[PDB]
Amino acid sequence: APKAVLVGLPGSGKSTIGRRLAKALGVGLLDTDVAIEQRTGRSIADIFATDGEQEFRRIEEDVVRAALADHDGVLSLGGGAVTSPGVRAALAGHTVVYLEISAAEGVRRTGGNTVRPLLAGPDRAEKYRALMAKRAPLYRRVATMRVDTNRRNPGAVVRHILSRL
Ligand SMILES: Nc1ncnc2c1ncn2[C@@H]1O[C@H](COP(=O)(O)OP(=O)(O)O)[C@@H](O)[C@H]1O
Ligand SMILES: [Cl-]
Ligand SMILES: [Cl-]
Ligand SMILES: [Cl-]
Ligand SMILES: [Cl-]
Ligand SMILES: [Cl-]
């Protein structure tokens, strides 16, 4: 099982804390989005456009289930994975770290146009707040550890987790 599975909104730090936490532990980081693009060969966007939500989530759950069983390092879960009941079920029993972030800080951490589908240019703040209202209850439901990252620098978040593992 993974040493830790990181979940949270876009910009909460899943990729960043994931990479840094994995390095600290001397283990590897597996990003479900990356695993999906490498399993299929197509990009996230392409899968959504062609196949669409339902098909994506299905491929995603499949990748997530294999990761939870085969990966022993740090696992960073795609932000919408928890919307799938099957994923929430698969997570039961694992160490799940919910990286919490405010909407104001979250929207600002993701302003780099690093490909944020759900956060289209027009009124990103409103969209981000809506995303939070929808996803937060789910992250809270699957989390075994909650970590506020609002005023904590990345290294502090990593040390916080490391000390609790
Ligand atoms: N604790 C933090 N303090 C300051 N900036 C952070 C922190 N965590 C993440 N960030 C920054 O916010 C951006 C989004 O981080 P990222 O790991 O890609 O988030 P996610 O994978 O959850 O979408 C990155 O540029 C990252 O360096
Ligand atoms: Cl995300
Ligand atoms: Cl399973
Ligand atoms: Cl590993
Ligand atoms: Cl299960
Ligand atoms: Cl909000």
Ligand SMILES: [Cl-]
């Ligand atoms: Cl909130």
Ligand SMILES: [Mg+2]
């Ligand atoms: Mg990520």
Ligand SMILES: [Pt+2]
């Ligand atoms: Pt909120």
